Amino acid sequence: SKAVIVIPARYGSSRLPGKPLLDIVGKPMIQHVYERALQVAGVAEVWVATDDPRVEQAVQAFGGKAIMTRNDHESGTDRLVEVMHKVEADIYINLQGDEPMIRPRDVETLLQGMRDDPALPVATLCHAISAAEAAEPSTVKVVVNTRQDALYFSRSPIPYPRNAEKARYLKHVGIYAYRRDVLQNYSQLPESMPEQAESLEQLRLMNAGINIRTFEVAATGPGVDTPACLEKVRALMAQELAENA
Amino acid sequence: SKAVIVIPARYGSSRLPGKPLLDIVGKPMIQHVYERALQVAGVAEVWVATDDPRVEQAVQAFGGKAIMTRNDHESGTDRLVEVMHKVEADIYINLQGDEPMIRPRDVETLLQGMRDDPALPVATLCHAISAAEAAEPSTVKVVVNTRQDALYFSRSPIPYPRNAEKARYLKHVGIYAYRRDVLQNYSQLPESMPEQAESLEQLRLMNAGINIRTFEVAATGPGVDTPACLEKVRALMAQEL
Ligand SMILES: Nc1ccn([C@@H]2O[C@H](COP(=O)(O)OP(=O)(O)O)[C@@H](O)[C@H]2O)c(=O)n1
Ligand SMILES: Nc1ccn([C@@H]2O[C@H](COP(=O)(O)OP(=O)(O)O)[C@@H](O)[C@H]2O)c(=O)n1
């Protein structure tokens, strides 16, 4: 069972032009993700999928593997489907190019889940959040059954707090593991109404009846979208280098 | 494939004591539901499951069949499980005793769905509602997939309207059809966190991984919970003559 990690890294970004190239403790952001991806046991290769030559050059400059993809891609999943035809594997893991604080152990949990159940098509991550955080539409909530299979993903607070003290919220962490066959049949899937309404691409899979198992992990580090969080990542990243002395 | 209709009708109610016996244009509410249930093709028997002797006698008075059940049940679903042991069938349809405006056609759609797919454990109904109506916590929303299987039931407006013009809403209509095996295993199912938070008993089934197919019908008539709704139903059933 061969598994590879693909890191989609688009340059073009509105509030952060050239986001993967931003410096964090002397290295571009994309490098931090790549270095951490390399620490994941059981992975054969790590690739960076991009549509911009400046990102491809930055990646090659530190010796990483880069693959140019079409710029007409509407999402990180469509970009992964194109990489799938060229890079062979049984399990593809999609890592965000803008989350430099990813824990290698969490990706291993995801990979072990896939290997422990050959019938599982897709696997993703989640962590507990408070009711106050769950109120934000920018945060994606998920509700699961006893087998930890996702029932639904939403920007609306789910479950609804009728009996508030009984509610427990789970935040969806955008890291995915796909079986090869799911990606091969992906482009044939039509867009769903819930997907278009919520603007959550993962609902396209749920519409087609494709099961998505969600594994729970500890609260993850802050991502990078706002320059307010960027400074916290830099200080948090630097604080980490001094701790491991 | 024997199918039976069970109408849970306890005497008590916080807002309308003795609800099943309330008069609606000459007949107690329970009789209206029972008579409409009798118009459903493909059903072998119709039973009223009750906890009170006054309800039982009223049903027998008009010629219907009634069965006494325990008074300690918390839901009509639990009451149905007790009946399943006494009345043998392959498919059990659970009708609300306080929804006298039920269309026999809608119950037939539900029954046909169960018969068209032997693997289907549970089936229920739903109908389109506006975005304004979906915002109400008292209205239960449901989201389905291409095969019309429910993904989740919630009091929250789902799907979330990020792109408002793309969102389409469905309201869950509390009528259910259960395969016998589901009812035999019901008492073993643990309550779920989502069930307790939302206060929706059907989430106990989803938690256990039991599939629930949702069939779409036209907007339904109002139920009778408050004395205000009772006056509206009386008016609606009067002009319907
Ligand atoms: N059309 C797109 C959109 C996102 N992506 C990538 O997929 C991940 C998730 O994107 P995102 O939610 O942070 O939104 P943006 O990165 O586009 O600002 C990032 O690594 C993106 O660069 C992509 O490769 N192609
Ligand atoms: N403990 C209970 C609660 C409801 N029910 C029945 O289930 C149906 C719907 O009840 P409901 O929960 O929606 O509202 P209530 O009738 O309980 O006030 C009615 O026909 C009730 O008589 C029951 O048989 N036993």
Side-chain angles (χ1 to χ4, degrees):
Chain A
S1 186
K2 186 189 181 187
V4 306
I5 290 176
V6 180
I7 301 162
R10 202 186 193 197
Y11 183 100
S13 187
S14 51
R15 285 162 52 233
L16 277 181
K19 191 167 59 178
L21 310 186
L22 298 169
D23 189 272
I24 298 178
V25 296
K27 299 172 180 172
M29 182 167 68
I30 190 67
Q31 185 173 339
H32 285 287
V33 180
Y34 196 96
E35 293 185 18
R36 284 166 188 258
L38 284 175
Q39 300 176 37
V40 180
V43 171
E45 308 165 47
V46 177
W47 291 80
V48 169
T50 176
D51 60 346
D52 194 284
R54 294 171 289 180
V55 178
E56 177 192 36
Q57 270 309 300
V59 174
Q60 287 172 353
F62 60 78
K65 303 178 184 183
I67 175 173
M68 281 289 281
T69 57
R70 295 188 299 274
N71 49 245
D72 53 80
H73 276 322
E74 44 189 307
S75 64
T77 299
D78 291 302
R79 173 167 274 94
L80 183 70
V81 170
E82 185 193 342
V83 173
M84 179 269 306
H85 289 303
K86 301 185 172 184
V87 180
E88 181 187 3
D90 302 310
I91 298 171
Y92 296 82
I93 296 174
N94 204 45
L95 280 190
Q96 304 295 264
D98 62 1
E99 286 178 47
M101 293 199 74
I102 175 63
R103 295 185 296 257
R105 231 58 59 218
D106 292 353
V107 186
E108 295 179 352
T109 297
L110 188 63
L111 226 192
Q112 190 60 80
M114 289 291 279
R115 286 185 168 138
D116 287 352
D117 186 2
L120 185 57
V122 186
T124 191
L125 296 176
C126 69
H127 72 80
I129 53 165
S130 70
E133 282 196 33
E136 287 303 310
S138 49
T139 293
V140 180
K141 278 68 60 169
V142 59
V143 173
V144 304
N145 64 14
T146 49
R147 290 187 295 266
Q148 296 189 315
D149 291 335
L151 292 179
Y152 187 62
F153 294 84
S154 187
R155 294 182 185 279
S156 287
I158 56 170
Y160 182 82
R162 175 63 138 217
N163 291 299
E165 346 76 41
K166 296 293 181 181
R168 187 175 180 272
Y169 296 91
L170 290 170
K171 171 185 180 174
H172 173 49
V173 176
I175 296 174
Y176 302 87
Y178 304 92
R179 225 87 200 189
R180 183 175 176 80
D181 57 69
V182 178
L183 293 175
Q184 292 181 293
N185 297 311
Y186 191 85
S187 64
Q188 298 309 310
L189 298 183
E191 290 182 47
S192 65
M193 178 284 289
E195 176 200 341
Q196 298 175 293
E198 297 249 12
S199 192
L200 294 174
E201 192 176 29
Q202 64 272 46
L203 294 177
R204 188 175 307 176
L205 297 170
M206 298 198 87
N207 187 56
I210 296 170
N211 184 51
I212 300 178
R213 187 156 295 144
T214 307
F215 299 87
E216 198 186 319
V217 296
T220 57
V224 177
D225 286 294
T226 173
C229 285
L230 177 55
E231 304 302 312
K232 194 168 76 290
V233 174
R234 283 189 175 119
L236 232 38
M237 208 87 94
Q239 187 272 312
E240 198 177 311
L241 290 179
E243 178 180 37
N244 303 299
Chain B
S1 184
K2 185 185 173 192
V4 304
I5 289 176
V6 179
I7 303 160
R10 61 164 180 147
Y11 185 85
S13 179
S14 67
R15 273 288 199 67
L16 288 170
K19 193 162 66 172
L21 300 179
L22 292 181
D23 180 271
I24 300 179
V25 297
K27 298 166 174 172
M29 184 167 67
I30 192 67
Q31 186 175 344
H32 283 288
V33 179
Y34 194 98
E35 290 185 339
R36 288 175 184 246
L38 286 178
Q39 290 166 58
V40 179
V43 178
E45 306 168 22
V46 179
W47 296 82
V48 174
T50 189
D51 63 341
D52 204 276
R54 288 169 288 184
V55 179
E56 178 194 40
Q57 292 299 101
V59 171
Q60 290 172 3
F62 67 70
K65 299 182 182 180
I67 175 164
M68 278 291 287
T69 54
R70 306 186 63 67
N71 52 256
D72 58 25
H73 292 308
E74 304 169 311
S75 68
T77 303
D78 291 304
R79 197 177 301 288
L80 178 69
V81 174
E82 175 177 2
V83 178
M84 176 274 298
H85 288 297
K86 300 166 188 167
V87 181
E88 288 193 300
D90 300 300
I91 302 169
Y92 295 87
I93 299 182
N94 203 49
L95 283 189
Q96 305 296 261
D98 59 357
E99 288 186 46
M101 303 197 84
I102 177 63
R103 297 183 296 252
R105 283 306 177 74
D106 296 350
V107 185
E108 293 179 349
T109 296
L110 188 69
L111 224 195
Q112 194 56 52
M114 292 286 285
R115 284 184 170 139
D116 291 351
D117 182 359
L120 187 56
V122 187
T124 192
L125 299 173
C126 72
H127 72 81
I129 53 167
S130 70
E133 296 174 272
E136 324 284 61
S138 60
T139 287
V140 179
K141 278 72 63 179
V142 63
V143 174
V144 305
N145 64 19
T146 55
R147 280 186 182 193
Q148 298 187 314
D149 290 333
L151 292 177
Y152 189 58
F153 294 86
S154 188
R155 293 182 186 286
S156 278
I158 53 176
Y160 180 91
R162 176 62 118 216
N163 297 316
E165 88 288 352
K166 293 294 195 304
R168 204 207 166 231
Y169 298 92
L170 293 168
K171 173 188 174 178
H172 173 45
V173 174
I175 296 175
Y176 300 89
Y178 302 89
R179 223 97 204 180
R180 182 180 174 76
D181 65 282
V182 177
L183 295 175
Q184 290 175 291
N185 295 301
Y186 196 84
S187 63
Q188 289 172 18
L189 303 186
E191 291 184 55
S192 66
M193 180 278 286
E195 173 193 2
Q196 301 179 336
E198 297 254 8
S199 209
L200 293 175
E201 192 176 21
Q202 65 270 42
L203 293 181
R204 192 180 309 170
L205 296 173
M206 301 200 88
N207 182 63
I210 298 175
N211 189 50
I212 302 178
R213 185 155 299 139
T214 306
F215 300 93
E216 191 180 337
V217 297
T220 54
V224 179
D225 304 275
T226 62
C229 292
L230 178 66
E231 297 299 340
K232 185 166 61 287
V233 174
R234 278 174 170 157
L236 281 173
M237 290 214 69
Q239 65 178 224
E240 191 192 75
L241 302 174

